[PDB]
Design a protein around this ligand. Structure first.
Ligand SMILES: OC[C@H]1O[C@H](O[C@H]2[C@H](O)[C@@H](O)[C@@H](O)O[C@@H]2CO)[C@H](O)[C@@H](O)[C@@H]1O
Ligand SMILES: OC[C@H]1O[C@H](O[C@H]2[C@H](O)[C@@H](O)[C@@H](O)O[C@@H]2CO)[C@H](O)[C@@H](O)[C@@H]1O
Lengths: 445, 442
């Protein structure tokens, strides 16, 4: 939504406790008279880099830390410099997750990892291994039930199994990720995705199953197990299903390795409410009371705030969450992560639907990820400098030529003379908007 | 501002007489007409065009307008058939570019040999006479010849005499690949000029102001200048004659002929005002007379008044030297030509370069000038290599067109110095604003 000075607009995912966040925003307005609006737009992580620094986006964006590296590379995030006093209140490993090229670029909020969730009434002792689940499903099927439903549309949920036997995103040693060494192709990844695919083939799961379908099934008591994060516990509580939260099953004796996200709050680089945002984040949200308000709505997991984390550590569900976290890996925050997640999402969906073989799917994913950094434009359109092409491109290259004090061709200046007054004026105004965004990003540094 | 008129014209021309017709315009229209004469106005204009910091009307030799037009800085002019017949057809030609009229022709101007009758009763008819002439005058405490050596315009008539030429003219087009700055003719003309200097007949530092002061005080017998110069000379009370330029190897001195022209900025909100001013106030008998009465224009483009003044012997001399020379080309490449020859002449004059050095340098420099427009991006730009301004510009292009930049390019964006990038981008925004003012004025 359109940002004004003297107000705060926040984006969070629709699965997070946005209503509880709205409540701490209410206390903020009570004290400051500054209105806080919380929104949960669809595809906000894709949306943000598109509207950032223009004024059409939020002042504050919430998301797992993995996407913030790409934002920062674009310069879309304000640098966070909290006082050492505040920085001490949060676990250091959580600040690590939001540090990019020597700069802190967001506030860590909570650590989230997937767990195995099970119906204690249907399944008193959940399976310790993935390999046991087919026999278990056959057993539950005879009673009109299902062994396991979790959404297969999002790579976040299937990745833990794919990584169990040796799959990895980017090779990590010391403090660096090797963008040339991707592990989506290897034997471990294939074995993990193959087991998943066989699950579907043998009718133990359906390839179409998404978040909504899996949640409803578990919450209605139709399935004995699901895989989900702390945010899901609220709805399960409401359905009164007697459930347990535990360690994910092993694959080939090895733990499922979930990617660990740190839910983090970023401040838009061009925001005129930067001081406002930092006050809200530091002094209202990242407190025992602010976190409890959000956690009350939808559980955060293990909060980054030492004070409240120790208080919530007692909960067995959170201990299970943290146990899975230790067995998994903190997500890298590098820009290539976007390419990784996109390529792997395609591979899992294609393999699961029998659309491609496992080997075909993963080879494609690996190639797509390995080559992504080498992308970008390499040549201008053949006749752009001659004045050939869409009017938008032509006015853009004329702008380029003027910026660099270089004389345009005759074919190009003819287009400039021939363009309609209304057409050129709308196209340019957009350019003005782009230039203004660029200046705001540089100025915020 | 809207409802005001700002005009630029060279400072040695009749800007005061021009301001007079402007007060006339203000009397009948209520719109104030401001006249300014910035130094290097012909170089400054493309810098300030469409920004709001420049003039509504710019006066200059037709020479420079082909370049202005190519950058879209000029408004197309479309006078009636009635007004067009008022001016000589050959002057409308000089202000034709890409099948469009881009300025109003005012007057035709060419250089002439001006001489002191008291010091030199019969002026030299050849150039080769001048050295010995200088010796004769030096014994009387005088000088033979002083004229501006800092501007290629004043030297060119000598350089072009023995076969030096700007751009070849075949058919109805100028051969952009055929430049004659390095040939034997150009060599002979400049070498002589240089030997003239090393033999202390002239000084390489001599500029417009110095030469004018010397002639008008009667310290030098000759100078080389345009019709605009006659006004100050009249006032100095020096008895002078305006005659044909000297010869060189029996061949005539070939001055480049200029048509003083008035042009309107593409972004002017007062274009309608400007056109009425130029057509109905300036380019009349009364308007031109007012200007010519300040500083002589030469042979004006208005048929009527040119006929009334083709009686003055000074204009007769002007036109006489004009026939011997050539009308300047108005192509965009003319800008690179003048700059290249300016350096070659200044360099040779100071012994900084030998003549062959200076001309070969200018020649290849004029032949490889990119007025034909950009054909390729610089090597490695899209890979993120090059000067920061260019890299920032291409990143802007990419954002404008929603195209993904390379990683090298993205790396330059994060690596750029803040103050440097900010000044470049603020500049970009002003450039974009100028483009919009041009469109908004249509
Ligand atoms: O899918 C719901 C769940 O996904 C998120 O994980 C993301 C990752 O963070 C994104 O950058 C993108 O790559 O897709 C992944 C899902 O495949 C969050 O970590 C989590 O909070 C959110 O609820
Ligand atoms: O000398 C280079 C210069 O020559 C011409 O400039 C003349 C101008 O045309 C005259 O009207 C008068 O102002 O004297 C000037 C030279 O001092 C060209 O018009 C100009 O573009 C070129 O650079």
């Amino acid at each position: 939504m359109k940002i004004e000075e003297g107000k705060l607009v926040i984006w969070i995912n629709g699965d997070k406790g946005y209503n509880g966040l709205a409540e701490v925003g209410k206390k903020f307005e009570k004290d400051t008279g500054i209105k806080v609006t919380v929104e949960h737009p669809d595809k906000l992580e894709e949306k943000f880099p598109q509207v950032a620094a223009t004024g059409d986006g939020p002042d504050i964006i919430f998301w797992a830390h993995d996407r913030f590296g790409g934002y920062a590379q674009s310069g879309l995030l304000a640098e966070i410099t909290p006082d050492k006093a505040f920085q001490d209140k949060l676990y250091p490993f959580t600040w690590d997750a939001v540090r990019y090229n020597g700069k802190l670029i967001a506030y860590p909020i909570a650590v989230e990892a997937l767990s195995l969730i099970y119906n204690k009434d249907l399944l008193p002792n959940p399976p310790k291994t993935w390999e046991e689940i087919p026999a278990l499903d056959k057993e539950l099927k005879a009673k009109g039930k299902s062994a396991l439903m979790f959404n297969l549309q999002e790579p976040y949920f299937t990745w833990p199994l794919i990584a169990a036997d040796g799959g990895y995103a980017f090779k990590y040693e010391n403090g660096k990720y090797d963008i040339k060494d991707v592990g989506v192709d290897n034997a471990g990844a294939k074995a993990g995705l193959t087991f998943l695919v066989d699950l579907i083939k043998n009718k133990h799961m359906n390839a179409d199953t998404d978040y909504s379908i899996a949640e409803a099934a578990f919450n209605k008591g139709e399935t004995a197990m699901t895989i989900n994060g702390p945010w899901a516990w609220s709805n399960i509580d409401t359905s009164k299903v007697n459930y347990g939260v535990t360690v994910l099953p092993t694959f080939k004796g090895q733990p499922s390795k979930p990617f660990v996200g740190v839910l983090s709050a970023g401040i838009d680089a061009a925001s005129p409410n930067k001081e406002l945002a930092k006050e809200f984040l530091e002094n209202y949200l990242l407190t025992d009371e602010g976190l409890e308000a959000v956690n009350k709505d939808k559980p955060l997991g293990a909060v980054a705030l030492k004070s409240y984390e120790e208080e919530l550590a007692k909960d067995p569900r959170i201990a299970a969450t943290m146990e899975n976290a230790q067995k998994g890996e903190i997500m890298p925050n590098i820009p290539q992560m976007s390419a990784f997640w996109y390529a792997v999402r395609t591979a899992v969906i294609n393999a699961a639907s029998g659309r491609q073989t496992v080997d075909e799917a993963l080879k494609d994913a690996q190639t797509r990820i390995t080559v992504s950094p080498f992308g970008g434009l390499k040549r201008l359109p053949a006749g752009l400098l001659l004045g050939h092409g869409p009017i938008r491109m032509v006015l853009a290259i004329l702008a380029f030529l003027r910026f660099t004090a270089i004389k345009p061709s005759l074919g190009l200046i003819n287009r400039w003379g021939s363009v309609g007054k209304k057409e050129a004026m709308e196209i340019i105004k957009k350019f003005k908007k782009d230039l203004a965004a660029m200046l705001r990003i540089i100025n915020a540094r």
